[PDB]
Ligand binder design. Structure first.
Ligand SMILES: [Cl-]
Ligand SMILES: [Cl-]
Ligand SMILES: [Cl-]
Ligand SMILES: [Cl-]
Ligand SMILES: [Cl-]
Ligand SMILES: [Cl-]
Ligand SMILES: [Cl-]
Ligand SMILES: [Cl-]
Ligand SMILES: [Cl-]
Ligand code: NA
Ligand code: NA
Ligand code: NA
Ligand code: NA
Ligand code: NA
Ligand code: NA
Ligand code: NA
Lengths: 492, 124, 122, 122, 126
């Protein structure tokens, strides 16, 4: 119901009041415990509001010869860690308050997955369906030009990212404009933006990054007995029914990695309909069907579902579409026990209250929806390294692994007086695939799993410390606030 | 039934010790060690960050553990004898097509068992 | 304790066998079957994608299995005797309101036992 | 091997009862009690019902329970004897640097055993 | 049909006087057992797990609860459960309306031409 800007400030104030006394304890300045609380409450007053907001009004020229002035905004919430990171939205519904809110969310999201980026967010007020491809390029490049001279884009100041109505195509124009004009003398000019194509300096494994992040986000809690015991489910993914809402980029890879581990997708719903099949839906069949006709309506191996996709009887619900889809109205009717927020703030704070009362696990967005942001940090490092991950180590590591297995083979053959080839030590079926198909995608996906797993322990620890139970969101915001605070406190 | 237990009483007086006196606690500790092994193994796999997965005996198992007496071994051995001997009667009945004539199945079984002792012992 | 174990030594000479000589490997293999049965059944319930669920004995259980000797059975039977005999002294001391007079409770305990064998023998 | 089992036959005739005659069902019912205890302990924790988490013995353990004979015990005890005796042979072959002369290591152990019975007797 | 409050005590009092419960269905599922279901064991199972699915002494029944072959059928749930399209497929000879208006008038016509005794709601549910 309420605007998202009202939500993030409420999440911050709730986490700031809980972590306040622990910040004063671990703060070891040369003051008494009364002045230290003034510093804690003083630093928290700095982190909460956005530091910089650039309102723009640049002109473009349409193909018909007409003139048009475009309106755009970009907010930098925190500068405690440079550069700033965030997406760019090309919608009509974009406002400044909505930009400052998602900019603050990016700050706390980056801190959860231990990504050293300040939160940022951008948005121009156009509808891309009303502009041609050539017109969209002039809007993108000119927007990049105006952000560059005002210090709102660059490899060490602000690194934008894709968002709604924005893909890798816009990121190419953004990196190309900066690398040819203001940042021509910058050796890392192509690190000014992420989400780029592989040809323009992108990283492998980016398309399925956010989808793999929501899988490892559920997996880290689906395999913990203490959390599954509070619900009525056994640990594991076998015979787990999950519903995907919004068959977009995240929803496509979310169901593919859940179906891979034994989970059965019983329903997928978008804005134009919802299909249903309690015996499972093949992700590959639905992906090829979505590509052909641009909609999941009329799937052969499924039946139309004339009802709310969020109220389907299931175990896991994955909202991966629009904002505020679970409010005080439909939340008391949700049958799922685990809610994985594949989108940015799809649950109202009032629905969070009854979800905690109904004993329903809600994995928060600032942790679970950070898979793409994690490898966006990896793409930024890749452009700084000027080389793909594993380019210099793949053959070196592969030869070392074959040396290790051969050392076991020869040592055992010599121990028992057998000639060569008698005791073959070969990699397993899984190890052989990880060796032959070794690519940069393999390293960034394992690095994403390491980040999502390690962040899950930090959330489980502080939630268990403050007896927050199934309130994963509060425990997540307490982790982010405490991390940003230590950067401010230990600096002066 | 009583004859079978009378055989057990004869063995107890020969063993000069009641049944279970030497083993009741040794098996009790083993049972708790197996359940504790499954508990720590499951906590290592699914409870790495807080929470215990208690593996406790059932109501019927806890009664067999807390109230473990020689009577429990005797009656368990009696049921073992009545079960095996019943199948021996059923096998002989279907062998000679005796149907519901269990008595003839039992006397044939008893006569055959007594004869093999006499025969294999030899007379000469 | 020594008297109780001397009873076990007397029984062992009558059995002409050490305790466990006939059953040590049988118990060891059955326990490894039970743990594998819980493992094989749990891995079937939780699938194979989540990884194997190894169920192994605890540190104390592994030591009890590998170092299985007659002393373990004797010391377990001794603990069983001392435990049960303690409940008899506590019961008699409470029935006669002796409080901390465990000695008197131990003598009425024994006198009542020797009397019962004498009485029902006629 | 036959000598070891012949020792068990002598003990069997002294016990006047077959091996396992009084414990086969008691041990089998406990084996099912341990598995069901794990099943009911997991279904209670995760809020399941009935046989949602079935815990059955393995196919090998099923063969152990189904058809347990006195033969199974004496073969397990024979395996326990041949194993422990093999360790005693390897131990003194290593101690006396006998290498592959297992016969000498076996006679050295037998002589030491027979000697200890004489010496400690008087 | 419907193990709420009426169906619980209807099953309890019928089983007490010799009758045998064969199937119990709800909006969650349907259990079945041809040799009787205990009302007390079903009441404790419904109270514990919040539903009736997974009863240890009753196999599941994936067919229609109203079409189970029996002698007496007790609708105790929603309005208009017996309908013109499903009336010619019932097997019970007595339909004990343990709920208000569970039979359509067209189903009443089929139940009348088939010699099926329907005890109305305004008397039985009183
Ligand atoms: Cl509203
Ligand atoms: Cl332009
Ligand atoms: Cl509920
Ligand atoms: Cl570098
Ligand atoms: Cl070779
Ligand atoms: Cl080979
Ligand atoms: Cl918790
Ligand atoms: Cl046969
Ligand atoms: Cl004797
Ligand atoms: Na599969
Ligand atoms: Na709200
Ligand atoms: Na609380
Ligand atoms: Na004896
Ligand atoms: Na035969
Ligand atoms: Na006399
Ligand atoms: Na040697």
């Amino acid at each position: 119901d309420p605007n998202f800007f009202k939500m993030v400030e409420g999440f911050f104030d709730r986490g700031a009041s809980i972590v306040e006394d622990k910040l004063v304890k671990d703060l070891r300045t040369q003051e008494s415990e009364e002045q230290k609380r003034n510093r804690v409450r003083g630093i928290l007053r700095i982190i909460k509001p956005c530091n910089h907001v650039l309102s723009l009004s640049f002109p473009i020229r349409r193909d018909d010869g007409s003139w048009e002035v475009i309106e755009g905004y970009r907010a930098q919430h925190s500068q405690h860690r440079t550069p700033c990171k965030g997406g760019i939205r090309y919608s009509t519904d974009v406002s400044v308050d909505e930009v400052k809110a998602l900019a603050s969310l990016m700050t706390y999201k980056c801190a959860v997955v231990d990504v050293p980026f300040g939160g940022a967010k951008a948005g121009v007020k156009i509808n891309p369906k009303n502009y041609t491809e050539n017109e969209l390029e002039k809007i993108t490049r000119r927007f990049t030009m105006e952000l560059a001279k005002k210090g709102f884009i660059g490899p060490g100041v602000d690194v934008p990212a894709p968002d709604m109505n924005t893909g890798e195509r816009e990121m190419s124009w953004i990196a190309d404009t900066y690398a040819s004009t203001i940042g021509h003398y910058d050796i890392n000019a192509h690190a000014c933006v992420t989400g780029k194509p592989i040809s323009q300096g992108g990283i492998h494994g980016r398309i399925s990054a956010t989808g793999r992040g929501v899988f490892h986000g559920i997996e880290n809690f689906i395999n913990e007995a203490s959390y599954m015991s509070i619900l009525g489910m056994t640990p594991g993914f076998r015979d787990k029914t999950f519903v995907v809402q919004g068959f977009g980029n995240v929803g496509l890879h979310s169901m593919r990695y859940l179906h891979r581990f034994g989970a059965k997708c019983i329903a997928v719903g978008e804005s134009d309909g919802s299909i249903w099949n309690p015996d499972g839906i093949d992700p590959k069949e639905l992906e090829d069907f979505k590509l052909q006709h641009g909609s999941i309506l009329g799937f052969p191996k499924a039946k139309p579902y004339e009802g709310s996709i969020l109220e389907v009887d299931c175990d896991i619900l994955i909202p991966a579409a629009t904002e505020k889809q679970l409010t005080k109205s439909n939340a008391p009717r949700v049958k799922a026990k685990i809610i994985a927020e594949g989108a940015n703030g799809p649950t109202t704070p009032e629905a969070d209250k009854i979800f905690l009362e109904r004993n329903i696990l809600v994995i928060p967005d600032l942790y679970l929806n950070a898979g793409g942001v994690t490898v966006s940090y990896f793409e930024w490092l890749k452009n700084l390294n000027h080389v793909s991950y594993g380019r210099l180590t793949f053959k070196y590591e592969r030869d070392s692994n074959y040396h290790l297995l051969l050392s076991v083979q020869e040592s055992l053959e010599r121990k028992f007086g057998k000639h060569g080839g008698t005791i073959p030590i070969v990699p397993t079926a899984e190890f052989q695939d990880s060796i032959s198909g070794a690519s940069e995608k393999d390293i960034v996906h394992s690095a994403l799993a390491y980040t999502m797993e390690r962040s899950a322990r930090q959330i489980m620890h502080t939630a268990m410390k403050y007896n927050l139970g199934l309130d994963l969101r509060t425990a997540a915001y307490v982790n982010a606030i405490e991390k940003v605070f230590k950067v401010y406190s230990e600096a002066g | 039934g009583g004859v079978t237990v009378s055989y057990f009483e004869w063995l107890k007086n020969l063993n000069h010790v009641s049944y279970g006196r030497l083993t009741f606690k040794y098996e009790r500790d083993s049972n708790y060690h197996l359940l504790l092994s499954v508990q720590e193994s499951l906590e290592r796999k699914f409870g790495k960050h807080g929470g215990t997965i208690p593996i406790v005996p059932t109501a019927e198992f806890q009664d067999s553990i807390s109230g473990a007496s020689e009577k429990d071994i005797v009656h368990s051995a009696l049921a073992y004898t009545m079960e095996r001997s019943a199948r021996q009667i059923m096998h002989t009945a279907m062998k000679y097509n005796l149907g519901l004539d269990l008595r003839t199945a039992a006397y044939v079984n008893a006569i055959e068992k007594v004869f093999k002792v006499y025969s294999e012992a030899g007379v000469t």
